[PDB]
Amino acid sequence: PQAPIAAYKPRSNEILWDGYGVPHIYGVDAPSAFYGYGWAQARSHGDNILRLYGEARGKGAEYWGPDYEQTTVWLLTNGVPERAQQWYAQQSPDFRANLDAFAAGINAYAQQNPDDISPDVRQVLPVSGADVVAHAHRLMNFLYVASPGRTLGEGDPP
Amino acid sequence: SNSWAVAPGKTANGNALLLQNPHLSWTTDYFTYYEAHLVTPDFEIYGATQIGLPVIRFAFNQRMGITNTVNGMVGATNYRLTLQDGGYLYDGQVRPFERRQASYRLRQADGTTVDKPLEIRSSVHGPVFERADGTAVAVRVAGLDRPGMLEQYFDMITADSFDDYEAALARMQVPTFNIVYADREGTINYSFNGVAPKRAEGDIAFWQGLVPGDSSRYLWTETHPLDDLPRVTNPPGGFVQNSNDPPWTPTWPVTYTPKDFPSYLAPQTPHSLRAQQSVRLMSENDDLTLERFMALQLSHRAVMADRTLPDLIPAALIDPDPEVQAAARLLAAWDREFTSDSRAALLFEEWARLFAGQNFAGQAGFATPWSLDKPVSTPYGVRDPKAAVDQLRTAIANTKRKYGAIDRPFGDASRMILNDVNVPGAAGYGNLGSFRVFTWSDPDENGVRTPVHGETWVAMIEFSTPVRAYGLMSYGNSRQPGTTHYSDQIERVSRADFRELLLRREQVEAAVQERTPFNFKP
Description:
The complex is a heterodimer. By secondary structure, chain A is mainly alpha-helical. Chain A has helices at residues 30-56, 60-64, 69-77, 80-89, 93-112, 129-145, 148-152, and strands at residues 14-17, 23-26. Chain A has seven helices and two strands; from the N terminus they run ββααααααα. A two-stranded antiparallel ribbon of chain A has the order 1-2. In chain A, strand 1 and strand 2 (23-26) form a beta hairpin. The N and C termini of chain A lie far apart (50 Å). Chain B is built from twelve helices and 30 strands. Chain B is globular and about 70 Å long. Chain B starts with a strand and ends in a 5-residue tail after the last strand. Classes of the chains: A mainly alpha, B alpha+beta. Chains A and B meet through strand 1, strand 2, helix 1, helix 2 and helix 3 of A and strand 4, strand 12, strand 13, strand 15 and helix 1 of B. Strand 2 of chain A pairs parallel with strand 4 of chain B, so a sheet runs across the interface. Chain B: Its main location: periplasm. Chain B: Keywords: Hydrolase, Periplasm, Signal, Zymogen. Chain B: It is found in: Periplasm.
């Protein structure tokens, strides 16, 4: 029948980054790998990720002012930040631990490397599993499926 | 976005092939892709995902892989309400809104926040919005009760078998996307996925418009299970594809027709020229190697030139203006590829913007309309040659104004520029027929343009044992101020010089440049 090659069994938690800045994340279990993954994403994209998570708490307007207000109004009105809290509580316990680990990794990168975090996204920290759920929820249902432009009667150029 | 999956029988080596190829903005927060590799004792996944997602959406490993394209799954409804008496008319009765008073803080220029009131009103349908013109709109979004989107993707991409993958996909927690699957066992699959409301009447266009919000007749409550949606598994054609086209030619020969599904799932509109190229590139080629598969992904044919130039050119050589005559001659000598060194390409684009509108999608100019029966060879020809020549006249002007000449090399105007890296462009607009896509900006005052949208993450995988995979990320793997990992891939992109994606531990050890040990305890 011919089996796939042997899986690798990670014996310690490490990220091996290659020349192009691609993180190879080895965890001894699922929450480790997810933590590693949140660490790596914060290394590579922390500023925007944190900004995006701040928006998905419906706190865009509060953190960054008027250019963020319409998304705030769109997401609060569609009850996105609170549904995220619910969705979070409704996760299976095993998967909830993975989301908590991912948020922890993001937080821990920002902790051990405060110089790498742009000043005006600092107020966002700490981030939580629910934050991670919320952003995914804005992305899928409230950017892809129901865009503010289709409802408010607009949309973006070519 | 493009997606190919090729069955073993269609390949030289007898292993399946997979193309990951999403097209998104190069310059937009939540659309930025990231490449990573996760390994535990129990699972392995490699690939790309939008930043801030804890699961890889374009994943593969030693056993299986998936990819995604946008399908426009109409998962929401906008309802036009009839305001009357402080409530809204519904089934002959005035019915009041649910109201709550919420608030949010707004940051002021001086660092303080003011407290801002926000009324939130809902009808039966959902939350209510007032458009700038006065139309009160209530939005009803399917699948607000599907909390397992993330875990579904995670279970799909770590599936131990096609059956496990399918069971995971069937939970209906991922509300959108065409999703394509291939594996080392030899199975390939296309699914038009998403959460689709059950409706008793109306086509897609009716459901995309403003549905009347004054009647329970239009209030849906239920959604379609997975086996109500268009799907294809190991088709007789030996491949599946999607290029953002309607789900009606996911393989060749087709395995179903539009009348087999409710009419509101997906449109029956003409297929883009890129989508037409997708179908031929796959169906016309047998005995594929990974190398040949990769070469096919680079296709940049100016298909619209093929459909129009045989009529346009003879018409234009008749015109008295010598500049029009010279444009026609330049156009006729063109091999109709979007190469860096093309002197006719920019000029052709500008005529096409007039002939088919600014997004190149208009159909009115063609002599023969797109037809379900010749679905990769229509629309064809020029309906009004005289009118089109006048369009060429204006296009000569526009080309000169934008770029400085009617014959500037494509890749001198078309540049990929990140930080201080500046490289020649090639390929172009999907709607002109280019498979590999670069949606070029409007040019700057020097006629230089750059991609706004197009090839981002590109990976091609053969499920041999061990797997073989090659990828590139246009805009690098990081976007933090000062990273060396933003502009460090684009030169390779300009040469189509793909990285071997490193999955096996020994390969990873040979390539490591930074070790971060970490330790996590809850």
